[PDB]
Amino acid sequence: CTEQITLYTTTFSPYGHRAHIALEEAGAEYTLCQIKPEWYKRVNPLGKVPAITFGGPQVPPDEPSPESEKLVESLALLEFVADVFPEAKLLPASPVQRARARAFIAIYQNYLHDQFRDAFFRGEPVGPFLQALETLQSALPPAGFAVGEWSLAEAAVAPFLARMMLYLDAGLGKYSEADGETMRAALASERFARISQYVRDIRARASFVKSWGGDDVQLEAAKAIPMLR
Amino acid sequence: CTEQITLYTTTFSPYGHRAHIALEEAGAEYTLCQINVHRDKPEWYKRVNPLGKVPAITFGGPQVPPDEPSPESEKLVESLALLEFVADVFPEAKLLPASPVQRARARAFIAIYQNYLHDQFRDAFFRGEPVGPFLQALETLQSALPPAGFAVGEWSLAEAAVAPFLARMMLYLDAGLGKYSEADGETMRAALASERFARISQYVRDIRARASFVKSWGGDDVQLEAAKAIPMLRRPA
Ligand SMILES: Oc1cc(O)cc(/C=C/c2ccc(O)cc2O)c1
Ligand SMILES: Oc1cc(O)cc(/C=C\c2ccc(O)cc2O)c1
Ligand SMILES: [Mg+2]
């Protein structure tokens, strides 16, 4: 591909971290723009972020061209990179294996994503989070990533599982000291050994390393978030 | 495609209907196995999915009645994944458009359905919550459509994903099914025939005209009957 690619995100957005991982896996040449400025309504009138501009002239990100195609919705941005760079095999080759990668993302979206938010941001009962974590965990093979090799599955879920672990280790979140104790114990137990290794293997992935600030930075960022208290 | 395809669904499931639409759009040779919602699910279904998940596809393996699933078939669940599977198996059907950008916009339209309207359909019709959010989400979805035609001009998986749900909620509305108050029902019915919602009204009848929808829908009267036997849709006395 030769069209210009520009990815827009807020600095520590997990949704934008999705698109950042996939552009890295793809070997793409792209501009990265972290931040809401007045100009941004030219990327998306609604202020939706993350966003990708595609095609048009090379432009500084804060001057998006009227010619470029503008795209939003993080999981569609994943599919987009995969489609633009088929040669990077961001998804596997067979339809069945692609179907399992997508099913795995749906498990995260439909079952775990909201309870992660209940347990860590709304201080709600933690029980359902751990069950949804297990359910996603159960869809992993004994080794490797969700469908064996790295795929959009990982781009989709990595930013969120890595932040969960970072928060739990750091005691950030709105859960009770009691529920926080219960989650630290679950994640360190054999029940959740598979998912814990998954995150470890995720965190070793070069595309994750590059698009993660480092634990230092993510932590400094984290400790300026209200909903984490 | 030479592999056998079998689609398992509880009857009248909008989730299974998604994949039905897509198999009909694809021109696929497929076997359709309907399970009764209100029975328990046959013991044999565990061989298609141990947790009883529907809808589900078996792919390949030997040719077998659906109640005799072969272990040699690959088994897939999750309706939005099943849509992308059919497109992947039948690329000549162009269930998604050709360019990455248009593909991305079709997938984004599915996201808007899921992020906003899907849960207000449940809240307003099955839980009886105030319906203002439901209208606003319908508007949000409506504003993502182009001036005419389908979400990305030509029909795509966007319609496979959203048609089963948009059609049932408009069916339920005109017939007054749901847990919402009777005032909120007149509010919704009035809003839907208003000019505010002309575009989404045009989208729904354009959906209902599509061959693949007609054949997988099997008529309003049988969808009404199916819905009058969903207990969660009944206001209590
Ligand atoms: O058998 C039927 C008939 C029908 O009309 C709708 C449904 C389900 C709708 C639904 C479920 C979960 C959710 O979060 C949101 C939803 O809209 C099932
Ligand atoms: O790779 C793909 C492609 C696609 O079209 C859909 C999905 C999955 C789930 C999904 C999408 C959007 C959303 O807001 C919620 C969802 O559950 C996965
Ligand atoms: Mg609600």
Helix (H) or strand (E) holding A156: helix A152-170
Q: Which bound ligand lies closest to the C-alpha atom of A109?
A: 2
From CA A183, how far away is CA A17, in angstroms rounded? 24
Classify strands B56-59 and B74-77 as parallel, antiparallel or unpaired. antiparallel
From CA B70, how far away is CA B68, in angstroms rounded? 6
Residue ranges per domain, chain A? 1-93, 94-229
From CA A81, how far away is CA A62, in angstroms rounded? 22
Helix (H) or strand (E) holding B160: helix B157-174
Contact between B83 and B160 under an 8 Å Cβ cutoff? The reply is yes
Resolution (A): 2.3
**Quick check: helix, strand or coil at residue B152?**
strand
Contact between A137 and A112 under an 8 Å Cβ cutoff? The reply is no
Closest residue, chain B, to A85 (C-alpha): B100
What CA–CA distances, in Å, run from B117 to A8, A212, B37, B132, B178? 26, 33, 24, 12, 16
Comparing C-alpha atoms, which of B201, B199, B210, B198 is closest to residue B17? B210
Q: Spell out the residues 6+ positions from residue A107 whose beta carbon is closer than 8 angstroms to its own.
A: A135, A136, A139, B78
Nearest to A83 among B80, B81, B103 (CB): B103
Q: Do A103 and B74 touch (CB under 8 A)?
A: no
Q: Do A69 and B107 touch (CB under 8 A)?
A: no
- Ligand 1 site, residue B122, Cβ cutoff 6 A: yes
From CA A148, how far away is CA B226, in angstroms rounded? 42
What CA–CA distances, in Å, run from A5 to A38, A40, A86, B80? 21, 16, 16, 27
From CA A206, how far away is CA B126, in angstroms rounded? 46
**Structure tokens of B148?**
């005419």
From CA A85, how far away is CA B197, in angstroms rounded? 39
Method of determination is: X-ray
Measured between beta carbons, the chain B residues lying within 8 angstroms of A84 are: 100
From CA A105, how far away is CA A78, in angstroms rounded? 11
Contact between B134 and B184 under an 8 Å Cβ cutoff? The reply is no
Measured between beta carbons, the chain B residues lying within 8 angstroms of A95 are: 59, 85, 88-89
Residues B3-42: b if buried by 16+ CB within 10 A, e if exposed: ebbbbbbbebbbbbbbbbbbbbbbebebebbebeeeeebe
Contact between A91 and B115 under an 8 Å Cβ cutoff? The reply is no
Q: Spell out the residues 6+ positions from residue B43 whose beta carbon is closer than 8 angstroms to its own.
A: none
- Sheet with A51-54, strands from edge to edge, namely A31-34, A5-9, A51-54, A69-72
